[PDB]
Design a binder for this molecule. Structure first.
Ligand SMILES: [Zn+2]
Ligand SMILES: [Zn+2]
Lengths: 222, 260
């Protein structure tokens, strides 16, 4: 029953960290007996909040998709002109797009008739047919070029991060921007108690070491 | 109202502090923004000065501050009045080194002989109840009040009494006065909080709770009483430079988190 010792160490690091206080209305100063390879760390308060918020958004989205409860809003008069190869590509991945609330029919210089769209995508598309085509083609090419693997729903606790890679790029972008916008900003006041809650929640995240956009969330200063 | 001190010994002690003051180090404290306690055992706390983060030995800073206040408010101190009375003979019980009754009595003798001097110049009031020659009946009535809203921890009180008799040179005016001020400063500094392993199940619920409460007590003291005073009147001696370390330059950190 062997494992790689380097993976477990990353989680236990943050777990041994007590909050000092907010620094310059931008950072949360944290401090770590048995100081091996680990003392003082400054956490970006925005990156911290954005990270917690993203993982909550991802957990909600993937719980809906895996349980077949993801809302699919009915769309009218949405027909997109597609090439023969594009039409074959959409015909091939129709079943895959249904899992994300994207419901269509391939007709016949063919036509793609979009019947349903999830609420996130309905809002982003805002009637722009050229935008929607680009976004659906991007995912279809991701699938065909082995850059994204299909959503396996054959499996029956839900670890959202085991399916995180399957999420279309357009969904990732929407969740990244919602988390960024909802997050606390630089210049905002935080009490020691709010800082305690923020770091407690961060230490429970799957990846507490970066913000939603992959930039570092903390820097050791010791 | 304020009694005039014309003692040459005191004038020379004050000149010595004045010649030691480092202007730039004093500027860091003068405009400090207090962050919080970093280590309760090694007595470390973090502060921000401008856009720089510093690690400060508050044991070292408090020692120098209370020594400076003592020098300033010499012979003009208020009193801290002390059912739960304090007997000097009972305090020395913490020392097995004094394996004799007369060895413990010798210390009290040095202090009681100078009771008038200790009460006048330092507000250290010693009260006797029994005979004048009897040392078992000698109690401590009051201590000097150096900082309003602050009461020193008396954990260090049996060591204060022991050093007052054994360490202080009573044979020279300047060395004697200097030694008493250093002994008051040592008593007045906040206590160290030795690290206790909270994750270890082999320790009782009271041992872990008291440690938490000791940590909370120092944190409240530094934030509400000590750092406001340090910021208000502390003059940094050149020899304190090692106890003030720059841990972070925040403009370099803005670059790390420049864009999201
Ligand atoms: Zn952001
Ligand atoms: Zn980000």
């Amino acid at each position: 029953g062997k494992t790689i010792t380097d993976f477990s160490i990353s989680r236990s690091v943050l777990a041994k960290y007590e909050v000092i206080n907010q620094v310059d209305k931008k950072f949360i100063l944290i401090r770590c007996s048995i100081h091996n390879c680990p003392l003082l760390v400054l956490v970006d308060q925005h990156a911290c909040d954005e990270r917690i918020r993203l993982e909550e958004l991802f957990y909600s989205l993937l719980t809906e998709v895996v349980t077949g409860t993801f809302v699919a809003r009915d769309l009218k008069d949405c027909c997109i002109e597609v090439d023969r190869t594009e039409a074959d590509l959409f015909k091939h991945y129709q079943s895959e797009f249904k899992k994300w609330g994207i419901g269509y029919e391939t007709i016949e210089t063919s036509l793609l008739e979009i019947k349903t769209l999830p609420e996130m995508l309905t809002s982003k598309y805002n009637g722009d047919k050229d935008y929607l085509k680009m976004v659906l083609l991007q995912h279809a090419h991701d699938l065909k070029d082995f850059k994204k693997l299909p959503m396996d729903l054959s499996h029956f606790k839900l670890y959202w991060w085991k399916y995180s890679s399957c999420v279309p790029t357009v969904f990732h972008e929407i969740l990244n921007s919602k988390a960024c916008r909802s997050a606390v900003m630089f210049g905002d006041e935080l009490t020691r108690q709010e800082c305690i809650i923020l770091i407690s929640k961060l230490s429970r995240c799957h990846n507490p070491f970066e913000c939603a956009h992959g930039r570092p969330s903390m820097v050791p200063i010791a | 109202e304020r009694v005039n001190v014309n003692l040459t010994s005191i004038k020379k002690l004050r000149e010595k502090v004045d010649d030691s003051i480092h202007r730039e180090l004093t500027d860091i404290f003068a405009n400090l923004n207090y962050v919080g306690v970093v280590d309760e055992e090694r007595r470390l706390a973090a502060i921000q000065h401008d856009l720089k983060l510093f690690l400060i030995d508050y044991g070292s800073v408090c020692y120098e501050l209370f020594y400076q206040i003592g020098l300033t408010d010499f012979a003009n101190f208020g009193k801290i009045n002390l059912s739960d009375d304090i007997v000097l003979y009972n305090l020395l019980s913490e020392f097995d080194e004094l394996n004799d009754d007369a060895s413990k009595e010798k210390i009290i003798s040095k202090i009681w002989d100078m009771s008038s001097m200790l009460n006048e110049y330092y507000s250290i009031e010693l009260v006797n109840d029994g005979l004048d020659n009897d040392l078992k009946s000698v109690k401590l009535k009051s201590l000097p009040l150096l900082l309003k809203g602050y009461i020193p921890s008396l954990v260090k009180l049996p060591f204060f009494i022991y050093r007052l008799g054994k360490e202080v040179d009573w044979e020279d005016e300047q060395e004697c006065l200097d030694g008493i001020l250093r002994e008051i400063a040592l008593l007045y500094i906040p206590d160290m909080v030795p690290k206790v392993d909270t994750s270890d199940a082999s320790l009782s619920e009271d041992e872990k709770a008291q440690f938490i409460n000791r940590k909370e007590h120092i944190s409240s003291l530094l934030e509400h009483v000590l750092f406001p005073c340090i910021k208000r009147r502390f003059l940094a001696p050149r020899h304190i430079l090692k106890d003030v370390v720059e841990i972070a330059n925040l403009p370099d950190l803005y670059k790390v988190f420049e864009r999201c």
